Structure formats: structure tokens, C-alpha cells
Amino acid sequence: GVTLFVALYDYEARTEDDLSFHKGEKFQIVNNTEGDWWEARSLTTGQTGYIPSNYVAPVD
């Protein structure tokens, strides 16, 4: 299914394991099966890290 997600709000990371992003930034979800923080890869930077899942929505 749709595994590409878009940021609804900006987020500035505090820990080194989280990605920072702006609204509209796109992500490939790597793992959304463990917790409310999803492992994701930024489609802009290619970096993989953790994002707060309530900040994103499927692109379609």
C-alpha cells in the first residue's frame, strides 16, 4: 500500500536518532509496526531515522 508519507507540520529534532523536517517533506516508511515513532527515510536527504507519526499523513 501507500508507504510514502508527507509531513503536516515542521519538527526540529532533539535527539540524534530523530529526523528534522519541514511541512511537505516526504518520507519512505521503513518500519511503522513498533511504536508511535516510525522509522523513516527522508526523500530529500536520504537519511533514515525516527519521526513522530502524528506529524505525517499518507501522500495518497
Side-chain angles (χ1 to χ4, degrees), residues 6-54:
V6 61
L8 293 169
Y9 323 90
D10 277 22
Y11 172 76
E12 292 294 318
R14 185 182 295 276
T15 49
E16 51 208 16
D17 63 349
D18 301 329
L19 301 188
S20 298
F21 52 87
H22 307 282
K23 180 183 178 194
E25 185 160 339
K26 293 179 179 179
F27 300 92
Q28 166 71 274
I29 304 307
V30 176
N31 200 328
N32 71 350
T33 68
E34 272 134 10
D36 298 328
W37 291 78
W38 293 351
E39 193 180 24
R41 182 167 69 256
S42 169
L43 267 297
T44 301
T45 72
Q47 294 289 322
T48 297
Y50 282 85
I51 61 161
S53 61
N54 283 284

